[PDB]
Amino acid sequence: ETVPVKLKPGMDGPKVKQWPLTEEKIKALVEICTEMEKEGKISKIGPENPYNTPVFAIKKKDSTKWRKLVDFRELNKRTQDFWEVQLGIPHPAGLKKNKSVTVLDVGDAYFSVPLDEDFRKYTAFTIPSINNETPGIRYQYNVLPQGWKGSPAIFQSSMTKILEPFRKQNPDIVIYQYMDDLYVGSDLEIGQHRTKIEELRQHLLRWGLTYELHPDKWTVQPIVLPEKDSWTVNDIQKLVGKLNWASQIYPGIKVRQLCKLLRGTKALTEVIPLTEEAELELAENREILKEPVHGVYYDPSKDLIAEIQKQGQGQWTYQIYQEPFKNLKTGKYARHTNDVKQLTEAVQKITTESIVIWGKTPKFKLPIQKETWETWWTEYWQATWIPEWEFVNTPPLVKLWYQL
Amino acid sequence: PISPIETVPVKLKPGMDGPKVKQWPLTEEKIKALVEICTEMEKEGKISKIGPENPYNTPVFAIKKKDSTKWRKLVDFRELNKRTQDFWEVQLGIPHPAGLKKNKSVTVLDVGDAYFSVPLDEDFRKYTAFTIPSINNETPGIRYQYNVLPQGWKGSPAIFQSSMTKILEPFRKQNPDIVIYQYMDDLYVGSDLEIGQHRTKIEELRQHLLRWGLTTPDKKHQKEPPFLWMGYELHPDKWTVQPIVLPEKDSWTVNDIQKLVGKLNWASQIYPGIKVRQLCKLLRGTKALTEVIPLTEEAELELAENREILKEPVHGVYYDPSKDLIAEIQKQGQGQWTYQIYQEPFKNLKTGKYARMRGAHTNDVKQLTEAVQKITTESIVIWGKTPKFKLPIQKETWETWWTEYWQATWIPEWEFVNTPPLVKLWYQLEKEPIVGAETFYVDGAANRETKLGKAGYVTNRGRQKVVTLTDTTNQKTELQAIYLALQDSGLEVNIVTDSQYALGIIQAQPDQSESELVNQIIEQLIKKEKVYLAWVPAHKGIGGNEQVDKLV
Numbered sequence: 001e002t003v004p005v006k007l008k009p010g011m012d013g014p015k016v017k018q019w020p021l022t023e024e025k026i027k028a029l030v031e032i033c034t035e036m037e038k039e040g041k042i043s044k045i046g047p048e049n050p051y052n053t054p055v056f057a058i059k060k061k062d063s064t065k066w067r068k069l070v071d072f073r074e075l076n077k078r079t080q081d082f083w084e085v086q087l088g089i090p091h092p093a094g095l096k097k098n099k100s101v102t103v104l105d106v107g108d109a110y111f112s113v114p115l116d117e118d119f120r121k122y123t124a125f126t127i128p129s130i131n132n133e134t135p136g137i138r139y140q141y142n143v144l145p146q147g148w149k150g151s152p153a154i155f156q157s158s159m160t161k162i163l164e165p166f167r168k169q170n171p172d173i174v175i176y177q178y179m180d181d182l183y184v185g186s187d188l189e190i191g192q193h194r195t196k197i198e199e200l201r202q203h204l205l206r207w208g209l210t211y212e213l214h215p216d217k218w219t220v221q222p223i224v225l226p227e228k229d230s231w232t233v234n235d236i237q238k239l240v241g242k243l244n245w246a247s248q249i250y251p252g253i254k255v256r257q258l259c260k261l262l263r264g265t266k267a268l269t270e271v272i273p274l275t276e277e278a279e280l281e282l283a284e285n286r287e288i289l290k291e292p293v294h295g296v297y298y299d300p301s302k303d304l305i306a307e308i309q310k311q312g313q314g315q316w317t318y319q320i321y322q323e324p325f326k327n328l329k330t331g332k333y334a335r336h337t338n339d340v341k342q343l344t345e346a347v348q349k350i351t352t353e354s355i356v357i358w359g360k361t362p363k364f365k366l367p368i369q370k371e372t373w374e375t376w377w378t379e380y381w382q383a384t385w386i387p388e389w390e391f392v393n394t395p396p397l398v399k400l401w402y403q404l
Numbered sequence: 405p406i407s408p409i410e411t412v413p414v415k416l417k418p419g420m421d422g423p424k425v426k427q428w429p430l431t432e433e434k435i436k437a438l439v440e441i442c443t444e445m446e447k448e449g450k451i452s453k454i455g456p457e458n459p460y461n462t463p464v465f466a467i468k469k470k471d472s473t474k475w476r477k478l479v480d481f482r483e484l485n486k487r488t489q490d491f492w493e494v495q496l497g498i499p500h501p502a503g504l505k506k507n508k509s510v511t512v513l514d515v516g517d518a519y520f521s522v523p524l525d526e527d528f529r530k531y532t533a534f535t536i537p538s539i540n541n542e543t544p545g546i547r548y549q550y551n552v553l554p555q556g557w558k559g560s561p562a563i564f565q566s567s568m569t570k571i572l573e574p575f576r577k578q579n580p581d582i583v584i585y586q587y588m589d590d591l592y593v594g595s596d597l598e599i600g601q602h603r604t605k606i607e608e609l610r611q612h613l614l615r616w617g618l619t620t621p622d623k624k625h626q627k628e629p630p631f632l633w634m635g636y637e638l639h640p641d642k643w644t645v646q647p648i649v650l651p652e653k654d655s656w657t658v659n660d661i662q663k664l665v666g667k668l669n670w671a672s673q674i675y676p677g678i679k680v681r682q683l684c685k686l687l688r689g690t691k692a693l694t695e696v697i698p699l700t701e702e703a704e705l706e707l708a709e710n711r712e713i714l715k716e717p718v719h720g721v722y723y724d725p726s727k728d729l730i731a732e733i734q735k736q737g738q739g740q741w742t743y744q745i746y747q748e749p750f751k752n753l754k755t756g757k758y759a760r761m762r763g764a765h766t767n768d769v770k771q772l773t774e775a776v777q778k779i780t781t782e783s784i785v786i787w788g789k790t791p792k793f794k795l796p797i798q799k800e801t802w803e804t805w806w807t808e809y810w811q812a813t814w815i816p817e818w819e820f821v822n823t824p825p826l827v828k829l830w831y832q833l834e835k836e837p838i839v840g841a842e843t844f845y846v847d848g849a850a851n852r853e854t855k856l857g858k859a860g861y862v863t864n865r866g867r868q869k870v871v872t873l874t875d876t877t878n879q880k881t882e883l884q885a886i887y888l889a890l891q892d893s894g895l896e897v898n899i900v901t902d903s904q905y906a907l908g909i910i911q912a913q914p915d916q917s918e919s920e921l922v923n924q925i926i927e928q929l930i931k932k933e934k935v936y937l938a939w940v941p942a943h944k945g946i947g948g949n950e951q952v953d954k955l956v
């Protein structure tokens with residue numbers, strides 16, 4: 001059976017041109033796809049289909065096996081009514097409190113439901129050839145594709161059916177679905193946890209389905225205030241700007257008693273003492289930053305934004321927000337390697353945390369030249385979704401107001 | 405013939421239905437010509453006469469071809485087209501010669517009546533019905549509809565190219581070593597076999613082709629390589645750009661300089677070290693295509709350089725897939741980069757240039773990196789593989805630029821090559837403040853209405869200075885004030901500023917800028933021996949922030 005699927009009123013299908021791929025990925029893609037086609041998952045299509053989304057290959061993780069991956073960002077955006085506000089998958093506010101969360105791939109399940117025939121033409125993609133020497137191979141999807149936010153939505157019915165008993169039998173276990181992934185969490189000891197996962201996969205395995213998060217051990221990266229033996233004017237100027245900025249966030253942040261000591265035109269290198277009022281105002285903020293931003297709350301109707309600074313020496317800070325400065329979450333991430341590799345990993349990390357916490361993928365402000373990112377990110381990418389990103393130079397000040 | 409291939413279903417855009425355009429009356433002889441033509445076509449299948457229950461119409465004219473007095477039938481699909489569905493873009497992206505593999509023998513074959521050789525989708529023919537008007541239009545015209553793909557219709561290039569691919573599929577599969585390229589109604593056939601074996605597989609391509617409705621030029625006439633194509637000249641072993649003659653004029657119009665700048669740009673694909681900065685400088689400004697532009701010394705110089713670079717022929721080789729690509733880049737001028745790509749030095753597959761500036765300010769290191777990215781992408785397209793780079797930069801210089809720089813970056817496997825100029829950083833800012841160096845709390849400001857500005861500074865050594873600028877902005881004053889501090893200070897200076905705008909610029913360690921101010925601040929910074937730049941929150945009430953804020 002097939003659920004009747006439709007775009008949003010107005011918008012037409014996606015027409016995204018294929019990114020250039022390497023001989024490696026193309027070869028890979030041609031196999032994958034001739035096997036998917038002599039299995040009826042995808043069919044070759046004519047010029048009468050004007051639509052495209054981009055495809056590419058990865059090998060998942062430490063795995064020597066290529067996997068097709070389709071960029072459905074545009075289509076998802078252009079169907080978005082359907083996969084959110086008609087049927088839609090509710091997000092457990094407890095998943096983020098669990099001792100352990102396991103993520104496992106249930107994408108393949110989709111491969112067995114047929115797709116609405118009057119929607120298939122929107123899932124067209126092209127396998128490009130090198131130097132454009134021949135016409136790319138064009139395909140549509142017949143079954144539910146991975147990457148498309150219709151697929152979990154269409155399968156909601158069949159999925160809870162499949163998990164019904166396991167849920168009955170372990171009522172204290174959380175299972176949340178997002179795209180092609182199942183999130184399974186519990187508070188059991190790690191060993192009893194893993195056992196409950198194999199029990200789960202046995203259930204899945206009857207329908208077709210052959211890593212570990214520890215969300216507690218998630219805590220904030222406070223804006224850290226340098227602790228010091230002496231202080232130079234410079235050191236304090238540094239300090240005052242940094243408290244100065246925090247005020248644009250954390251209510252209660254005081255500054256006056258400190259910039260007290262920056263009086264007149266002193267030499268930057270000039271060691272100047274530290275009065276009791278300042279020594280006190282200093283400590284005061286120290287605990288405010290320790291704490292969650294008073295006043296900020298997640299709005300479910302608003303895009304999440306995440307921003308990343310490069311710290312150097314393999315450090316990366318990042319913040320998550322909906323309106324700037326009002327931070328829902330901040331953090332770091334650290335350390336074969338490569339400036340771009342790290343970021344691409346950091347993106348995936350932050351995205352993962354972001355899904356667990358809000359059931360939502362952030363839109364990333366990436367501190368890198370657009371063209372560099374595009375050339376390389378598909379090389380370190382091991383996730384099955386793709387967030388939205390835009391590129392931006394990091395104002396120099398911000399970088400350090402967040403440094404550790 | 406009308407190829408026996410299956411047809412492509414086509415529909416009008418979701419709202420509408422076929423056009424209904426009235427036929428303009430035509431002179432008595434244009435009417436005669438159309439009837440002759442359509443009788444011809446009709447007997448071939450291309451068109452079919454229809455009963456006027458069919459609502460649809462599209463205009464049709466006949467222009468008197470050339471001085472060679474025959475007539476040609478034009479149709480106006482403006483309206484059917486507007487109302488027809490969008491198709492998969494035919495081929496977008498075009499093969500570069502430098503990407504072609506070498507081939508022993510090559511043949512061109514041209515399809516005849518390509519468009520009229522492919523069938524149209526039944527359900528859609530109805531909408532392609534036109535009308536031949538009666539003399540002085542007094543009675544009903546004759547009405548035909550298309551059976552094959554009309555020239556000038558929206559979907560013709562798409563369906564045709566698709567059909568030709570569907571038909572070639574068999575041959576290509578049963579012959580994966582012979583190469584075909586389809587460009588429109590052209591087929592070129594590439595083989596690494598001898599003049600006999602090749603005419604052999606050619607002649608049975610033709611046979612396979614005629615089995616499907618497509619006729620081809622006999623093995624007797626008339627094309628042998630070299631071939632001209634999309635601007636290139638392909639030989640079986642090498643390629644080049646097709647002959648480009650640069651004019652010898654005493655007077656150069658804007659239009660003459662455009663065509664030159666574009667012939668040179670074309671040339672630069674295979675002619676190493678073409679430069680055009682000086683010829684493009686002319687074009688800056690707003691002038692008419694016919695206005696004459698007198699050449700500068702530097703531009704006349706350039707024309708000179710280019711003119712000799714072209715005086716002897718040059719060709720690119722083809723790509724041997726089993727060897728690494730090597731990419732060398734050289735600095736050729738300010739913001740100007742040239743590169744060559746080869747597999748055996750120095751027989752180039754291709755050369756290129758790069759002169760894009762990103763932002764108002766950069767330094768060589770940023771620019772060289774952006775050319776590596778350019779070249780890399782280009783590589784992926786043309787060869788599906790990144791090259792190994794040789795760059796006029798030391799590993800230390802680039803290791804230093806990146807680690808300290810705040811944008812993520814990464815270039816593929818590369819190695820130093822000593823080809824001057826070499827890229828360096830021309831100054832580096834201190835990391836910690838400098839003991840024993842005068843501290844300038846500087847500060848620029850502008851009144852947004854007057855656009856009148858006062859820039860200045862105070863030091864920890866009592867010094868002061870405030871000067872006045874006319875029609876600048878807050879931005880300029882803040883850069884002036886830092887420039888100030890640099891010209892009055894000595895070789896070790898600490899500069900404190902409340903301008904994040906200014907800090908950002910300078911902290912980026914530029915070495916070229918569109919701004920003259922900035923280009924000076926730069927001059928200064930290279931002269932200094934140590935400089936530390938600090939930021940402070942303006943108006944917050946800081947040491948020398950408020951102090952020299954009094955002076956502004």
Ligand SMILES: Cc1cc(/C=C/C#N)cc(C)c1Nc1ccnc(Nc2ccc(C#N)cc2)n1
Binds near residue numbers: 507583592629631
């Ligand atoms: C893209 C392309 C343009 C022309 C354009 C033809 C024209 N005009 C002719 C052919 C046959 C092809 N296709 C391919 C594919 C792979 N290797 C080659 N090598 C190759 C092609 C032509 C010559 C020649 N002369 C030498 C080597 N050609």
